[PDB]
Design a protein around this ligand. Structure first.
Ligand code: HEM
Ligand SMILES: *P(=O)(O)OCC(C)(C)[C@H](O)C(=O)NCCC(=O)NCCSC(=O)CCCCCCC/C=C\CCCCCC
Ligand SMILES: CCCCCCCS[C@@H]1O[C@H](CO)[C@@H](O)[C@H](O)[C@H]1O
Ligand SMILES: [Cl-]
Lengths: 78, 382
């Protein structure tokens, strides 16, 4: 066993939000196309990530993030 | 926090760039309209459609979605006209005028309970009880069930606002279940034994389903509670902040009509409504593409200098006052006459019965961006 990594924490949130298995969430998966996130899902995803990682993402930066990896990269970079 | 204290400077900066401003706020991208003529034009234009405040096919909050989507406020042709026409009977000029006796009665009764105290909380002691009593009486909700209705309205109003959270929507789904179940049971009672209320009126009927009738009741309950309370309380704060205008109105109670209209313009209870473009639309030298969201800032439009000279000046003598606080076009506020009547009677009677009304002194606004709603308004008198 181990403490939750950044990647694991991101995927846990995505899985809970979109009703998918935390292991069906691949790093390359696009939120809208692959994972099927609608125009509320993506808003609620950002709120959940902002809460989990105690951060504030500007709208312009959130627009850039389309993939699981991009979200992981943003959190790591910040 | 600084926005809620003074949203009008924020609106001004948008207007100076463009009265139709492309941008994104609280993660919601679209066109943000601060211009008066642009707002009016969009609201008149049926190609700009209303839409459900949650995604159409979303089942994350199934019961909340179902309740919302049945409301005339979020319905287009031909469902809108049918739903609106059936509810309109309770809000005609003549029917609204028939409410006056009960409104005056309730106002005096409410001011009686606080008269000896020299102190009052305008919202909890006055504005809210009046609005609650009035709309519950109109709908046909028993006095025993009125406190429960208050709780549903406060929870469900949050579900459409920019400031909403996952917690707000989950709580909203629970209140949606409760409210819908309650109104279905009240409709079953009125089906067997019709009464002199709006529920019975809706049942008579061209016609509504029992769920459509319930969602109609829920919508009117929310509107009757939230926005009307805001109008009354906003108006009182407004007048007290301008003692020279307050003195004018106390000395001349017939100015109440023009004064309430300026309170509507100056501190509009509803700060935002929204439309979606059903096709590509050219307006005001921009192109709004099909599917894009349009956010109409009614409080901002009400401060447009090309329509209102010295827009940031509160002047109760403004005539006429073509403010957009009740909206514009097909969805224009159904209960605007009732709202105006409640406010006019409440404010005039308050000023008459409390001759030395003063502020208790730093006001807090509720965390809603689509509405201008005070947390509380403490006052002293006599
Ligand atoms: C008890 C009093 C009130 C009732 C029963 C009521 C009811 C309603 C209803 C049923 C609608 C939807 C009509 C439609 O979609 O065709 C509506 C629309 C609207 N109401 Fe009221 N309302 C009340 C008070 C107010 C107040 C005080 C304000 C703010 C000054 C307000 C602002 C609006 C606006 C701006 C719309 C149009 C929104 C849009 O076009 O999307 N209402 N109202
Ligand atoms: P996707 O499926 O592409 O997402 C679109 C969607 C779902 C609209 C998304 O949430 C979004 O883009 N924005 C959400 C923000 C939003 O549009 N909010 C609604 C703005 S205000 C509004 O539309 C009109 C309401 C104001 C009138 C008030 C007057 C009556 C008083 C109270 C009404 C109570 C109604 C509440 C019902 C539960
Ligand atoms: C976290 C990224 C989830 S997805 C992300 O959601 C954003 C906010 O809705 C959108 O602006 C963006 O277009 C979309 O890719
Ligand atoms: Cl003054």
């Amino acid at each position: 066993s181990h403490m939750s990594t950044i990647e694991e924490r991101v995927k846990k949130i995505i899985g809970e939000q979109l009703g998918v298995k935390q292991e069906e969430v691949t790093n390359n998966a696009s939120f809208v196309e692959d994972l099927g996130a609608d125009s509320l899902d993506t808003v609620e995803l950002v709120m959940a990530l902002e809460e989990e990682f105690d951060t504030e993402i500007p709208d312009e930066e959130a627009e850039k993030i389309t993939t699981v990896q991009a979200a992981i990269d943003y959190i790591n970079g910040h | 926090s600084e926005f809620l204290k003074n949203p009008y400077s924020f609106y001004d900066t948008l207007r100076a760039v463009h009265p139709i401003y492309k941008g994104s706020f609280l993660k919601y991208p679209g066109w943000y309209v601060t211009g008066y003529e642009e707002t009016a034009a969009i609201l008149k234009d049926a190609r700009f459609k209303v839409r459900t405040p949650l995604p159409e096919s979303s089942t994350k909050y199934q019961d909340l979605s179902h309740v919302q989507n049945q409301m005339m406020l979020f319905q287009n042709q031909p469902d809108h006209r049918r739903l609106r026409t059936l509810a309109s009977g309770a809000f005609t000029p003549r029917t609204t005028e028939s409410y006056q006796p009960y409104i005056i009665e309730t106002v005096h009764h409410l001011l009686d309970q606080v008269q000896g105290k020299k102190k009052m909380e305008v919202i909890s002691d006055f504005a809210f009880p009046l609005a609650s009593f009035v709309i519950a009486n109109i709908i046909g909700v028993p006095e025993e069930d009125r406190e429960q209705l208050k709780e549903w309205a406060a929870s469900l109003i949050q579900t459409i606002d920019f400031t909403r959270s996952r917690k707000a929507l989950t709580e909203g789904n629970i209140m949606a279940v409760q409210a819908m179940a309650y109104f279905k049971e009240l409709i079953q009672k009125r089906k067997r034994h019709p009464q002199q209320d709006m529920i019975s009126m809706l049942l008579k009927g061209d016609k509504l389903t029992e769920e459509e009738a319930a969602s109609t009741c829920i919508l009117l309950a929310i509107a009757g509670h939230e926005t009307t309370v805001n109008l009354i309380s906003n108006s009182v704060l407004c007048l007290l902040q301008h003692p020279e205008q307050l003195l004018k109105l106390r000395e001349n109670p017939d100015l109440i009509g023009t004064a309430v209209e300026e309170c509507l313009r100056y501190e509009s209870p509803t700060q935002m409504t929204a439309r979606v473009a059903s096709e590509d639309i050219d307006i005001c030298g921009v192109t709004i593409r099909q599917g894009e969201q349009v956010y109409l800032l009614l409080g901002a439009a009400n401060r447009d200098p090309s329509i209102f000279t010295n827009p940031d000046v509160f002047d109760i003598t403004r005539s006429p006052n073509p403010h957009l606080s009740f909206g514009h076009g097909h969805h224009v506020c159904l209960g605007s006459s009732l709202a105006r009547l409640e406010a006019q009677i409440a404010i005039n009677t308050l000023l008459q019965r409390m001759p030395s009304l003063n502020l208790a002194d730093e006001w807090r606004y509720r965390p809603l961006f689509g509405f201008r709603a005070l947390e509380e308004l403490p006052v002293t008198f006599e």
